[PDB]
Assembly symmetry: C2
Homo-oligomer: 144 residues x 2
Amino acid sequence: MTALFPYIAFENSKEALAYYEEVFGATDVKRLEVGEEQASHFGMTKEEAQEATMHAEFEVLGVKVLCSDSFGRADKINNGISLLIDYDVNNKEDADKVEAFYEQIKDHSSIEIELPFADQFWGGKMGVFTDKYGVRWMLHGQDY
Amino acid sequence: MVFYMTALFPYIAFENSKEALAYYEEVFGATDVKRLEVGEEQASHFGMTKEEAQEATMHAEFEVLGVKVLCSDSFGRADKINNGISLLIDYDVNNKEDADKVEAFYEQIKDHSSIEIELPFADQFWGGKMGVFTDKYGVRWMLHGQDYTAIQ
Ligand SMILES: [Zn+2]
Ligand SMILES: [Zn+2]
Ligand SMILES: [Zn+2]
Ligand SMILES: [Zn+2]
């Protein structure tokens, strides 16, 4: 029923969505552009509107992230609020996906590794990194 | 046999999570508050006094409208909280139990002195409800009611 979603204000969500699709393996990408009619209403050209995003979404590791363009109204993305992806180390399907995702992302030039993804002394796995847009991601594997 | 599904949680870096947790308990009606303080033994390891460690938080959680928020102290390492990443609470307008809780929560929070209303919580032309506000810590919350009845 009730669910929480981060809602990110990107400078350009069109670019950011292509980045997550390529670097993070993001799936189910949906993007609502500023319509040709809406261009005049917002105060932009036909081309500027085609590049702009009203509302968007993408799934990373089966979790949904919502986003929209800043339109010069939002603050720059920082690490004050990080996105933690929690998974059960005893759920093979998810555990393998997290493994594959990290394997594919760990060496990427856009990714800044804060804590390499690894098994922690008291249990589970924990990894921390920041992407080129400044989003801080934390991968948290727990034993339930 | 029993497994949990993958879930996303915001992880907030507060200057003081102890204070912030009391604020959410009081102003937001936050429930299931759990706080792990810096232990007396850990104080020396962290480079702080016994008192400073009792006030400090290593890990914490709280529920608002049945959704979980994680947090920890900044310890001067994290950036100041802004609206680059907002927290959207999504619910069904046609689920009376949840709809009433969202209504009651908003009614209780709208007039508070800590709360800055960006968009009053209201029905939207194309369907559902939407409301937007920022708290004293700079967290931007969005309330979003969805109608799953087709337009046609
Ligand atoms: Zn959509
Ligand atoms: Zn852990
Ligand atoms: Zn806990
Ligand atoms: Zn809506």
